[model samples]
Structures are given as structure tokens and as C-alpha cells.
Target: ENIEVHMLNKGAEGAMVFEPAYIKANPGDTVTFIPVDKGHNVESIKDMIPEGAEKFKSKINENYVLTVTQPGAYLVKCTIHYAMGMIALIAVGDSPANLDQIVSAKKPKIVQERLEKVIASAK
Candidate 1:
């Protein structure tokens, strides 16, 4: 199946947020990120992706499409607002295959917090 996630800003107390911040997908599923605000672009965290998943990034304010072929979790963030904890999670199966790697990977403070938040919520 396919899914769409909207990138939003100043939502719920002037915060930059990804609507439906958590996603559950299956192998071969596709996800399209629609930008509803400026200064937001989808970028995969190099250290936080699945083993065989291809990392990608979209231009600011541009939409991005990602195909989920690996059954794992993907940590994505808006480069421009990563400090604001603008992040999202994509789980391509019942649980992320690289959960340990994601948890141990180094990340900016806010980014790490957001990632942990999603992981906890998803479970």
C-alpha cells in the first residue's frame, strides 16, 4: 500500500511537526511526503536507516517519494528544523530490524529525543 505524510509548521503551539509523525508500512510500500510549509524537506539520517535501504533527501519545500523495500525503521527529519525536533519515523514491519543501531547511533539532542519518542509510541 501507499501513504502520504504532510509536512507542517506552526502547528499546535507554533511547532514544526510532521502530521502523522509515525508510519507503519510493508515491504514494497511507497511513501510520499507532501510539503505544506516552506523550509521543510525530508532527509534520511545516514546512521539511522535500515541496512539495505537507500537514503534520500528532497529539496526544501519539495515533495519526496520513498519506496520501502527493507523491513525496518527509518528515521527522517527536516534538515532546516531538526533542532526544533521536527522528525518522523517509518516502520516497514511489525518492528524495526535495526532498532539497536538506531538507538545507539549518534544524533543531535533534539533529533535523538524525537526519534526515541516515536519509537516508544510506535511500540
Candidate 2:
């Protein structure tokens, strides 16, 4: 599936939000990110990166592309506003291998809360 991610300043939820904060991507699927606001870039979080997938970061205000060739939970965040819950999870395949790693990162309380919020809907 082609997951179109929008990096926004203020979303329906609030500021610094990624539209469709949680999504499922199959192997070989592509995820494209569009920056609708300035100063926001995407980067994969360490320890939560999917196996065999390349680590990627987008230039501020520059669009980015990610091909999901691995099956797992890929966690991405905004360098500038991750603390404000600006993050998302892209799941591939049946189960997420690094479910623990996600929480192990220990993000801000808001981020943690948003994590569960997105995951909750995934189930």
C-alpha cells in the first residue's frame, strides 16, 4: 500500500502531528512523506527500527520516501517536536517483533500516550 504521510504543524488532534499516525505497510510497499509545514523532518528511532530496513532521515521541508522491505514495527518521529507526540508507527506483516523496544525508548509522557492511542486503533 502507498501510505501518504503528511507532516503538519497543527493537525486535527493538535500541533506537530502526523496524519494517520499509525499505519500498516506490506513488504515492498512504499511510504511517502509530504511536509505541509516547515521545520519538520522524519527520522527512524533507533532500537525500534525494523530488521533489514535502512535507517532514514528527511531534510527539513524536504519530502522523503521509505520502502518497507522488512516486516516489523517501524517507529518514526519528528526531530523538533517528537516530545509533543509528533511520531508514528508503521507496521508490516503479522506481528511486531520489537514491541518492547518501542516502550523501552521511553519518550515523553505525551508521546507515550499517543503511542498507545495509535496502537489501540491498530488492534
Candidate 3:
């Protein structure tokens, strides 16, 4: 299966939000991150990835396609707006194997709150 996520900046306040911030995929699925705005890039959080998962990062304004091989949760963020809490989550297979670890990963207050919401929604 394949999924596409748009990176958007909406309104005067210019909120940096990922369209469809939460995603679920099976192993071997692929996700494509498309930038609708400049200065945005996708990268996986080191501490938030599943065990045995390969980390991925893309250049600014570049589109990225990630192949999901790990059956767990993934936290992807925009380096430029991470402090502003621009992030997204992916849960592979039935449920995340690293759910507890992801919940405990250190993150900025805003980012952590966003993650918490995603995690809760996943369940």
C-alpha cells in the first residue's frame, strides 16, 4: 500500500501541519511526504523509531518516500518547525511494538503533547 502526506502552511499564523497527521500502514507499505510549501523536510526521530527500523531524512523542499519494514510506531518531524510542534505519526501493522518506548522518548513540551495525542488516537 502507498500513502501520501502533504506538508502545509496555512493561514497568517502559518501553521506548519501535516495533512493527515496520523497514518497506519502494514509492513512493506510506503509513505510519500510531499512538500506543499518550501523550507519543509521530513525526518524520523532517532529515539522514536521501532527497533531494527532504518532512519530516514530528506532535504529541504524535497519529497521523500519511506518503505515501512518495521512493525511499530514512527515519529516523523520537520526539523525547521519541530519546535513549533510540526510532526506526524505512523503505526505499522496491527499495533506498535515500541509504543511504550515512543511514549517515553524525550521531546519538547509542544512536540510531546502532539505526540501524546497521536498515540492516544492510534489506540
Number of the top candidate by lDDT? Answer: 2
Total clashes, candidate 2? 0
Candidate 3 positional error at 2, Å: 0.8
- Top of the candidates by TM-score: 2
lDDT values, one for every candidate:
0.83, 0.86, 0.85
lDDT of 2 by residue, 16-121 (tens): 9999888787898999999988989999987788768888888999899888887889889998898888998898888788876886676789988888878886
Candidate 1 collision pairs:
none
* Candidate 1, residue 62: lDDT: 88
Provide TM-scores for the models.
0.88, 0.91, 0.90
- Candidate 1, residues 5-92, lDDT tens digits: the string is 8888866424888877888889989899998888799899887888788889899998888888888888888898888988888888
Order the candidates by TM-score, highest first — what do you get? 2, 3, 1
lDDT of 2 at 62: 89
Error of 1 at 67 (Å): 1.1
Query: Compared to the true structure, candidate 3 yields what TM-score?
Result: 0.90
Off by over 4 Å in 1: 12-14
1 or 2, greater by TM-score: 2
